[PDB]
Amino acid sequence: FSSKTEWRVRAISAANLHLRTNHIYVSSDDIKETGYTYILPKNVLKKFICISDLRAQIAGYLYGVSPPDNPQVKEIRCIVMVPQWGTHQTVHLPGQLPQHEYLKEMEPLGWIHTQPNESPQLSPQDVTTHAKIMADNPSWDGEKTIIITCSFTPGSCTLTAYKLTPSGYEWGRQNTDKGNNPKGYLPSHYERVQMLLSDRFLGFFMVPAQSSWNYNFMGVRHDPNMKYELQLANPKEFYHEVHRPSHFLNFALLQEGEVYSADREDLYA
Amino acid sequence: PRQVLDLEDLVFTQGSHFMANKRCQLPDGSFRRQRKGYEEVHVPALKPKPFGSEEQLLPVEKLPKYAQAGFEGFKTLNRIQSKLYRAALETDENLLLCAPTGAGKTNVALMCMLREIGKHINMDGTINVDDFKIIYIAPMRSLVQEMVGSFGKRLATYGITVAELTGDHQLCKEEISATQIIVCTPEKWDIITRKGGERTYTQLVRLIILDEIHLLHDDRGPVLEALVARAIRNIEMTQEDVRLIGLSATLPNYEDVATFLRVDPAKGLFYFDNSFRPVPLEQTYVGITEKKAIKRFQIMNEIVYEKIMEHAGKNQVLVFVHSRKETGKTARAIRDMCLEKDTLGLFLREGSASTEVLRTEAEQCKNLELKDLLPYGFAIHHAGMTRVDRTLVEDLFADKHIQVLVSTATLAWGVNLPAHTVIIKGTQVYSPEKGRWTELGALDILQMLGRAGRPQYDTKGEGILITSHGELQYYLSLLNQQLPIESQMVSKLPDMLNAEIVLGNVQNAKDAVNWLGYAYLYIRMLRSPTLYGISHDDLKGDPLLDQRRLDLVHTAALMLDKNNLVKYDKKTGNFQVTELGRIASHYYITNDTVQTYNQLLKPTLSEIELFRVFSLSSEFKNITVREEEKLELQKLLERVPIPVKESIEEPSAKINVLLQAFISQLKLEGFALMADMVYVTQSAGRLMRAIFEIVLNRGWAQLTDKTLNLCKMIDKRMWQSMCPLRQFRKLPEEVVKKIEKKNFPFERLYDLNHNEIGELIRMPKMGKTIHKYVHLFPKLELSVHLQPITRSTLKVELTITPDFQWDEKVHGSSEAFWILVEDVDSEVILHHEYFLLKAKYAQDEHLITFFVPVFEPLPPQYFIRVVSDRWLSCETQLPVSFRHLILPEKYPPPTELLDLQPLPVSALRNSAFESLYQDKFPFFNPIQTQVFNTVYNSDDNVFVGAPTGSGKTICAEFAILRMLLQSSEGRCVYITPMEALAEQVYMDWYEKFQDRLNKKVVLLTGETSTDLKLLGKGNIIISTPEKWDILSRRWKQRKNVQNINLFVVDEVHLIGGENGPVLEVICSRMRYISSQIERPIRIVALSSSLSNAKDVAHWLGCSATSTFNFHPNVRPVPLELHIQGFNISHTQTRLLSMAKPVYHAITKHSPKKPVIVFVPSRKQTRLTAIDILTTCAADIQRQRFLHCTEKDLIPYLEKLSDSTLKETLLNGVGYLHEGLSPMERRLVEQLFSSGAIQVVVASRSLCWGMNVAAHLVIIMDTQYYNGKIHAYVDYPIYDVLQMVGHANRPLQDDEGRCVIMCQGSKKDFFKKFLYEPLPVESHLDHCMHDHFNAEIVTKTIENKQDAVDYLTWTFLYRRMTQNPNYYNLQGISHRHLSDHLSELVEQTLSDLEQSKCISIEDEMDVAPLNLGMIAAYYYINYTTIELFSMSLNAKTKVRGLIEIISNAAEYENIPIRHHEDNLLRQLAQKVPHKLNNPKFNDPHVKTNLLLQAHLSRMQLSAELQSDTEEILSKAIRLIQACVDVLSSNGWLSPALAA
């Protein structure tokens, strides 16, 4: 990235992200009709979209449960934001999976990440990331976990949910190429699951304890094997001050300043 | 009639520079001559006025001795002082002393201060500081900072504390409290008064000295205008005299100045032309003529050189320039000029000593520029260089070594070092406010010229003034007593009208016009209509200018309404304060700016938009981007971290970059740019604080967090991502930046050791200091405990524990925090409040209880944050989780009031019964109509929940009549929570039943011996829960208590409050009896409308049909409630501010009908009565509250003992408090009932035993001070409900009105808790022990299973299944309920066993013991008997026995009020016995002192005597307990002593 004025223009653009949060579209097609249904609370959805950014992709883990006497549906009741940095086509999450007392009761259901532009197909990077996560962690069930993509269409956010088929799981686990068009990536590796929004309950967030989540301005400090402890709070915005300590710290102190300064008494104080 | 004016046209554009005289006539010898490209006009040294034949300079020894000590080293007074000392010291009139600058006006001010000081002498001592306060209003901050020191030196002999007004509001108020002489600027005083910080000492402010009052002509003149106008007004209404001393320069319109100051032209007016100046000054004016500024500047330089060479070897020179850098520039330039011309030695001729002193001081100097200039006769003096260097320059000039000093007006203002010659160069200054180059101010010029001519050495000053030819006339008129003072009030009329409305001094256009009449604008407009846009036609049409004042007020109100600061109605011409207006008044922000904020701010703003909104403020409307600085502006744009949406070529972007640069601590180069930076920062402080207040009061969590962070960040001048240690200015920048480089979360350092942190930073030497500072950093620990109160409200108790070593030098007297309770998304605040942590109460827990609403989709959690108000990175957050929260079910609807026809008395059966109701009312109220068919014709248990004042006593009477019909030998027992109400009902039913139906009614007292006989004899037994329990505890033995036929309990809704558990246990025991004794003891319960009425009805056996629970809006007379928020954290300030709203509400709602005002404490009653009387007298409607005439008051006024009460009652208002005797209480009550007095101010504690009803009920400050915790505790909702229900006048009033003036914190709480029924919960668990020992001795409890069975009967069990969270339960499951019951019963039994009152065998069987027997017999607390048993030995005596009894635990409820400590200490030294380590806050030591005083039969205060009577009530039983325990132990001498 340019890192000189590109970030400034992107911050100016991202300041208006709360406008997108009222034109939301859901893709309801190709649904197999046999798998689970998923219900996402609009409060956490709006918070995620607001804290997101146009170009860089952000991602967060979903935790949820099934409502009593209705197991074929899953309500998403928590989102976890973890130390991460992402490019315009991938997100570099840490190896450590989230772990906390409150999360001990819910069941991981996958992850949700942004997309700078819409693509009618799940990307090879997304499928391989999900496959790697599932393989490394036995907790992720290949039938319950999904991936939710929020693509920034003109003045709107389009949400679509995808499930990983066993063929996709095997291909992702065996794969190593990180390019845009890896060999053996087929449209039979994933299938679309039914998701919908709901105003009838509220989810919450969980962020890291010691530091913040975003690392795009502190990438050199982001180690995939880094160990972090969770905390119950709300996430900051993408361009928050704490997320870019570089800009706010690299100034210089005052040495023999204010010497020739204008003499104006603070009469009121 | 009203007409809109054009204020911006009416104003004078030039402001301070505006002139009022079109001509300028000079003295005789005032020639002029055009020399070259400039005109020199000379004016000579006016000869002194010859001394009067009978006038001389009296020595200080002729002045009063109390005035001598203020004059140290002064043998004779100046001419003006010797002329007017008589008036300044021997009289208290308003003075207007017009004298030239430098003549010694401070000495006359000192004379007036000495007069005030000597008014109170403290003959045996020296002075009584705490009886008066004197204000010295000096315009310039440096002048104030010098005057404070000079006055301190002068009056140090008196011990008088002289100090300046500076710092935050709290710091300023504390300083005002501490000191006696307050030195301040007009703006500082005005802002403090607007915020109300000085309302506690306005009365003690007995004298104000307005120094250099001619500022009125200046653009700052409106500040003085409003200050004096408001002072004179308040003097007029409140009628307390404050002496005004206006010191002015000799200038025209001084007669108008005297009129405005209320200064008598004959006595209080004085005029001393420039002739009287102690050192006459020859004044030269060089007006440059050329029209090219470069040549103007060159000619200016040449002219200053010419004049310095003119006075080179003769006299010392003080050159005055504008800028700090310009001072050095001109000094060096003149040095080089005279060096080139070879005239450098004319200043430093071979004066070996002086020149060598100069050279050596140069070699020692650190400042390089001054070191360069000092070897020669030149020096510089500006505020931008070291204190040591500037004092060095000053003392060198005093020694007369430096021959020329170049400086700015700062020296002339803050230091009195006159010189023979003064030379003003240019008079040009860059004002960022006007954002351009403008001429010097009149005050500046007069002051800097006052330095011309040292009185000690110099006989004739020489003042040269180099200006523009066009500007010349202005300064000529200025210095030749020819520039009349003219008000600029038209410019700032709207803001000041808003400030007055906010203060409340003005309410409608009429009061606004009255206030405007007192403004200096009014007199000037009257005298010179043409100068103020008025025609002689308008003047003749309106001789008093009432029409013009009304038009001005109308236009100002129109603009205030357009900007929404005030809600103004053109119909009635009234004003209402809006939060925007209050913020504008508090922070002196223009109305256009507040409108801009109200229009721009939105909840979702980002930090990028925040800066733009701030920079769009109208206070910077003048500021504009000048392309000369645009390259540097672009550089700053690139450097600053926060993006800028706008382009660099916009003033908004300029302000944005300037503020970001100041925060970033960067260094700028342009003079104009850096001046603009300073200006914008100083304004931005207040602007950002105001924006923060707006967003907070509107409830936007994200935005308010941003804004508070930004205010703190501006104040500390550092970004919040930096290391917080920088906030300690003493820490080395090297180590702070090293820490910042080693970026880790700051909290990490807390857990580490000093060596550990030193090694982490790799700087062991500072490691210890870093440990010190990180431990000094403020830090709080939060602990939450929440209980659901209803389905839509929780109660959260939050405990705060400090974790930082307090230190005044860095923390101060107090640390302020904001507590914010916000929802799951942290986007809306649900409860925001202040929290002051004082040093006195540090390192100890603070309890903060509050109620927060809960909505339908139960959120997972709420967030409680505590954020420091000053410090950066000082926050603590806590998530409260609604994960295990069980919400109590939704209560059923209240029993609707069926529209039955009126019930005629003929519906009743017996003629004797009807007799006592026939004349009082032919029909009963609909409530009694509804309830009669069940109370009288049916025998089942009955409940009646109706609003207070609906006549539930009538239903009780119906129940008793039905019982009597059943049998004349039946017995009713009527239990009332409070003894006063018990006495009321005793009187009522003694007059009703016994005197007409010949039935016996007996009231039980605290004596079982007579209580048993009265129960056996009488037929209606009135009792209080404790007096009934002392009997029912032995119901198995007592057959009389068993054979009863009616149990009536009045107001069981008081079950949840204190002393409620006793009532609960007696009710449960009576139910259990009725169950066991073969005959249903019918029970009739009366209460206020209860939401959870079903629970109590089920507990009492009432049938669903027989539960009558109505709604608060079912009262026969409707109520109108009004809650007034008063967001004033400080309790005394809030109380005082409530004084005027009381009168306002009385006028608005109940102008002619009775009003009762409930006050928190015993002392406030008299003050509130006096204040209402004072405001009514200020209004023309004096004695308007005396519905009768004085003729009918003498017979009752002659019985009272309080002279103040007599005066108030004569004026038309009475009051009532515990201090008053019951006789006076009854007299005032009867007067109010008759209507002789409209207003009665009653103490809070008298709300219950109060036998009258009024039409209006005001309640002020629903909190009372508990000194045990040293905190203000809220009124119990039961007491508030009683006080509002007191507004029940059945026939006289169509409606009853009540207004509660409460903090915004309690506003919503009361709104929720007063319009709805009142859920009630039990507090039995905390007080089970006493009743449990009672039951075990009674043998009702024999095993723990029987204990659980007994618990199954109480109310607590009934609620333990509906609201489990209230009782620490986790589920309604039988398992959880059984576990909790077993735990609590086992805990209580184990505690009793440890106390040895009971014995537990097999861990399942329980038996009593001897100490428990004594405790149950004499009704003592088990812990009290325990303490008695352990502390009492065989050798104890009365001297220690009194201490033991005082330590008895029954007295722990004795009240501890404010101001109760000093008189208790005074008592402590006079009782025969001394107390060891006495903490007067302790109930036991207080009761010991009270018992000693009672034994000594010494005089006591009324409240102290009441507490003594309460003590003696139980002292007898405690001493019988002592006798019995000593008998059991077998100690003859201790028993004898007992």
Side-chain angles (χ1 to χ4, degrees), chain B residues 573-602:
Chain B
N574 199 50
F575 307 115
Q576 309 132 34
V577 312
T578 282
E579 201 46 20
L580 294 107
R582 319 173 104 172
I583 287 139
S585 153
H586 289 52
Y587 294 109
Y588 218 103
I589 164 176
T590 56
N591 318 339
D592 319 293
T593 315
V594 306
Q595 189 278 352
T596 289
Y597 292 166
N598 157 279
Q599 183 34 30
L600 267 282
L601 290 167
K602 324 175 298 164

Short mmCIF file of all heavy atoms in Angstrom, two decimals, chain B residues 573-602:
data_model
loop_
_atom_site.label_atom_id
_atom_site.label_comp_id
_atom_site.label_asym_id
_atom_site.label_seq_id
_atom_site.Cartn_x
_atom_site.Cartn_y
_atom_site.Cartn_z
N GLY B 573 -44.53 37.48 26.82
CA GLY B 573 -43.20 38.03 27.04
C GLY B 573 -42.41 37.32 28.12
O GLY B 573 -41.66 37.97 28.85
N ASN B 574 -42.56 36.01 28.24
CA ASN B 574 -41.88 35.22 29.25
C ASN B 574 -40.74 34.42 28.63
O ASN B 574 -40.66 34.24 27.41
CB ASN B 574 -42.85 34.28 29.96
CG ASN B 574 -42.32 33.78 31.29
OD1 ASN B 574 -41.87 34.57 32.12
ND2 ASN B 574 -42.37 32.47 31.49
N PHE B 575 -39.84 33.95 29.49
CA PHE B 575 -38.66 33.20 29.07
C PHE B 575 -38.57 31.90 29.85
O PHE B 575 -38.93 31.84 31.03
CB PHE B 575 -37.39 34.02 29.30
CG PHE B 575 -37.42 35.38 28.67
CD1 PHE B 575 -37.40 36.52 29.46
CD2 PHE B 575 -37.48 35.53 27.30
CE1 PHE B 575 -37.43 37.77 28.90
CE2 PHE B 575 -37.50 36.79 26.73
CZ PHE B 575 -37.48 37.91 27.53
N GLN B 576 -38.10 30.85 29.18
CA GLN B 576 -37.84 29.56 29.81
C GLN B 576 -36.44 29.10 29.44
O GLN B 576 -36.05 29.19 28.27
CB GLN B 576 -38.87 28.50 29.37
CG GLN B 576 -40.32 28.93 29.51
CD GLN B 576 -41.14 28.64 28.27
OE1 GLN B 576 -40.90 27.65 27.58
NE2 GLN B 576 -42.10 29.50 27.97
N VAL B 577 -35.70 28.62 30.43
CA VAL B 577 -34.31 28.23 30.21
C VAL B 577 -34.27 26.87 29.51
O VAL B 577 -34.96 25.93 29.92
CB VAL B 577 -33.53 28.19 31.54
CG1 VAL B 577 -33.79 29.46 32.34
CG2 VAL B 577 -33.91 26.96 32.35
N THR B 578 -33.48 26.78 28.45
CA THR B 578 -33.24 25.54 27.73
C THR B 578 -31.80 25.10 27.95
O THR B 578 -30.90 25.93 28.12
CB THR B 578 -33.52 25.73 26.23
OG1 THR B 578 -34.93 25.71 26.00
CG2 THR B 578 -32.87 24.63 25.40
N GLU B 579 -31.59 23.78 27.96
CA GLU B 579 -30.27 23.24 28.27
C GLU B 579 -29.19 23.91 27.43
O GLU B 579 -28.09 24.18 27.92
CB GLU B 579 -30.26 21.73 28.05
CG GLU B 579 -29.17 20.95 28.79
CD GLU B 579 -29.01 21.33 30.25
OE1 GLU B 579 -29.95 21.92 30.83
OE2 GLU B 579 -27.94 21.05 30.83
N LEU B 580 -29.48 24.17 26.16
CA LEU B 580 -28.54 24.90 25.32
C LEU B 580 -28.23 26.26 25.91
O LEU B 580 -27.07 26.67 25.96
CB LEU B 580 -29.11 25.05 23.91
CG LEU B 580 -29.27 23.76 23.11
CD1 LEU B 580 -30.73 23.36 23.00
CD2 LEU B 580 -28.65 23.91 21.73
N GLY B 581 -29.26 26.98 26.37
CA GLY B 581 -29.02 28.28 26.98
C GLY B 581 -28.20 28.19 28.25
O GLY B 581 -27.34 29.03 28.50
N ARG B 582 -28.45 27.16 29.06
CA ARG B 582 -27.68 27.00 30.29
C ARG B 582 -26.21 26.73 29.98
O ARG B 582 -25.32 27.30 30.62
CB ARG B 582 -28.26 25.88 31.15
CG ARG B 582 -29.79 25.82 31.22
CD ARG B 582 -30.26 24.58 31.95
NE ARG B 582 -30.72 24.87 33.30
CZ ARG B 582 -31.34 23.99 34.08
NH1 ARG B 582 -31.57 22.75 33.68
NH2 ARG B 582 -31.72 24.36 35.30
N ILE B 583 -25.95 25.87 29.00
CA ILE B 583 -24.56 25.61 28.61
C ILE B 583 -23.92 26.88 28.06
O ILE B 583 -22.76 27.18 28.36
CB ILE B 583 -24.50 24.46 27.59
CG1 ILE B 583 -24.77 23.12 28.28
CG2 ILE B 583 -23.15 24.43 26.89
CD1 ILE B 583 -25.65 22.18 27.48
N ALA B 584 -24.67 27.63 27.25
CA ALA B 584 -24.13 28.86 26.69
C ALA B 584 -23.77 29.85 27.78
O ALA B 584 -22.71 30.49 27.73
CB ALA B 584 -25.13 29.48 25.72
N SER B 585 -24.63 29.99 28.79
CA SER B 585 -24.32 30.88 29.90
C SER B 585 -23.11 30.38 30.68
O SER B 585 -22.24 31.18 31.06
CB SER B 585 -25.53 31.00 30.83
OG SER B 585 -25.13 31.30 32.15
N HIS B 586 -23.04 29.07 30.92
CA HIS B 586 -21.95 28.54 31.74
C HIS B 586 -20.60 28.67 31.05
O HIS B 586 -19.58 28.83 31.73
CB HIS B 586 -22.23 27.08 32.09
CG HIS B 586 -23.35 26.90 33.07
ND1 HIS B 586 -24.59 27.46 32.90
CD2 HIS B 586 -23.41 26.21 34.23
CE1 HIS B 586 -25.37 27.13 33.91
NE2 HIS B 586 -24.68 26.37 34.74
N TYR B 587 -20.56 28.59 29.72
CA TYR B 587 -19.30 28.55 29.00
C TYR B 587 -19.12 29.74 28.05
O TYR B 587 -18.27 29.69 27.16
CB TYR B 587 -19.17 27.23 28.23
CG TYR B 587 -19.07 26.04 29.15
CD1 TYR B 587 -20.12 25.13 29.27
CD2 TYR B 587 -17.93 25.83 29.92
CE1 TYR B 587 -20.03 24.05 30.12
CE2 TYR B 587 -17.84 24.74 30.77
CZ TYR B 587 -18.88 23.85 30.86
OH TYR B 587 -18.79 22.77 31.71
N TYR B 588 -19.90 30.81 28.24
CA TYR B 588 -19.69 32.07 27.53
C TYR B 588 -19.45 31.86 26.04
O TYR B 588 -18.54 32.43 25.45
CB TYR B 588 -18.53 32.85 28.15
CG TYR B 588 -18.76 34.35 28.21
CD1 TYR B 588 -19.12 34.97 29.40
CD2 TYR B 588 -18.62 35.14 27.08
CE1 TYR B 588 -19.33 36.33 29.46
CE2 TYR B 588 -18.83 36.50 27.13
CZ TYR B 588 -19.19 37.09 28.32
OH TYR B 588 -19.40 38.45 28.38
N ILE B 589 -20.28 31.03 25.42
CA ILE B 589 -20.18 30.74 23.99
C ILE B 589 -21.31 31.47 23.27
O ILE B 589 -22.46 31.48 23.74
CB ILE B 589 -20.22 29.22 23.72
CG1 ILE B 589 -20.50 28.94 22.24
CG2 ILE B 589 -21.27 28.55 24.58
CD1 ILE B 589 -20.45 27.47 21.88
N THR B 590 -20.99 32.07 22.13
CA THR B 590 -21.96 32.86 21.40
C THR B 590 -23.13 31.99 20.94
O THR B 590 -23.02 30.77 20.80
CB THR B 590 -21.31 33.54 20.19
OG1 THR B 590 -20.69 32.54 19.36
CG2 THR B 590 -20.26 34.54 20.64
N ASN B 591 -24.26 32.65 20.70
CA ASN B 591 -25.50 31.95 20.36
C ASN B 591 -25.45 31.32 18.98
O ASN B 591 -26.00 30.23 18.77
CB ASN B 591 -26.68 32.91 20.47
CG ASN B 591 -26.59 33.81 21.69
OD1 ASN B 591 -25.89 33.50 22.65
ND2 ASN B 591 -27.29 34.94 21.64
N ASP B 592 -24.79 31.98 18.02
CA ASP B 592 -24.66 31.39 16.69
C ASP B 592 -23.88 30.08 16.76
O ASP B 592 -24.22 29.11 16.07
CB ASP B 592 -23.97 32.37 15.75
CG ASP B 592 -24.46 33.79 15.93
OD1 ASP B 592 -25.64 34.06 15.62
OD2 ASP B 592 -23.66 34.65 16.37
N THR B 593 -22.85 30.02 17.61
CA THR B 593 -22.06 28.80 17.73
C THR B 593 -22.88 27.66 18.30
O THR B 593 -22.78 26.52 17.84
CB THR B 593 -20.83 29.06 18.60
OG1 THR B 593 -20.21 30.29 18.21
CG2 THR B 593 -19.83 27.93 18.43
N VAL B 594 -23.70 27.93 19.32
CA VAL B 594 -24.51 26.87 19.90
C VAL B 594 -25.57 26.41 18.91
O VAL B 594 -25.89 25.21 18.84
CB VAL B 594 -25.13 27.30 21.25
CG1 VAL B 594 -24.05 27.81 22.19
CG2 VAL B 594 -26.19 28.35 21.05
N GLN B 595 -26.12 27.33 18.12
CA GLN B 595 -27.04 26.90 17.07
C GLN B 595 -26.32 26.01 16.06
O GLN B 595 -26.87 25.00 15.60
CB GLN B 595 -27.67 28.11 16.37
CG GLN B 595 -28.80 27.74 15.41
CD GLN B 595 -28.31 27.28 14.05
OE1 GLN B 595 -27.12 27.37 13.74
NE2 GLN B 595 -29.22 26.78 13.23
N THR B 596 -25.09 26.38 15.69
CA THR B 596 -24.32 25.58 14.75
C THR B 596 -24.10 24.17 15.29
O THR B 596 -24.23 23.18 14.57
CB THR B 596 -22.99 26.26 14.45
OG1 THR B 596 -23.21 27.43 13.65
CG2 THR B 596 -22.05 25.32 13.72
N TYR B 597 -23.74 24.07 16.57
CA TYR B 597 -23.57 22.76 17.19
C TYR B 597 -24.87 21.97 17.16
O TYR B 597 -24.90 20.81 16.73
CB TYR B 597 -23.07 22.91 18.63
CG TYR B 597 -21.66 23.45 18.76
CD1 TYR B 597 -21.19 23.92 19.98
CD2 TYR B 597 -20.80 23.49 17.67
CE1 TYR B 597 -19.90 24.40 20.11
CE2 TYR B 597 -19.51 23.97 17.79
CZ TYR B 597 -19.07 24.43 19.02
OH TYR B 597 -17.79 24.91 19.15
N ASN B 598 -25.97 22.59 17.61
CA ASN B 598 -27.25 21.90 17.64
C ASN B 598 -27.65 21.40 16.26
O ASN B 598 -28.33 20.37 16.14
CB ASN B 598 -28.33 22.81 18.22
CG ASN B 598 -29.73 22.41 17.79
OD1 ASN B 598 -30.17 22.73 16.69
ND2 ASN B 598 -30.43 21.70 18.67
N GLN B 599 -27.26 22.12 15.21
CA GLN B 599 -27.62 21.72 13.86
C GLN B 599 -26.67 20.68 13.28
O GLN B 599 -27.11 19.84 12.48
CB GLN B 599 -27.65 22.94 12.94
CG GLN B 599 -28.08 22.67 11.49
CD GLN B 599 -29.13 21.57 11.34
OE1 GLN B 599 -29.95 21.35 12.23
NE2 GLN B 599 -29.09 20.88 10.21
N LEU B 600 -25.40 20.70 13.66
CA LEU B 600 -24.41 19.83 13.03
C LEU B 600 -24.25 18.50 13.76
O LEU B 600 -24.20 17.44 13.11
CB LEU B 600 -23.06 20.54 12.96
CG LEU B 600 -22.76 21.30 11.66
CD1 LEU B 600 -22.36 20.33 10.56
CD2 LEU B 600 -23.96 22.14 11.23
N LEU B 601 -24.17 18.52 15.09
CA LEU B 601 -23.85 17.31 15.83
C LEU B 601 -24.87 16.21 15.56
O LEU B 601 -26.08 16.46 15.53
CB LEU B 601 -23.80 17.62 17.33
CG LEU B 601 -22.61 18.46 17.80
CD1 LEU B 601 -22.83 18.95 19.22
CD2 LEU B 601 -21.32 17.68 17.70
N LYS B 602 -24.37 15.00 15.35
CA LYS B 602 -25.19 13.81 15.18
C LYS B 602 -24.57 12.69 16.00
O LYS B 602 -23.37 12.71 16.30
CB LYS B 602 -25.30 13.38 13.71
CG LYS B 602 -25.36 14.53 12.72
CD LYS B 602 -25.34 14.08 11.25
CE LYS B 602 -24.07 13.33 10.87
NZ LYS B 602 -24.25 12.57 9.59
#
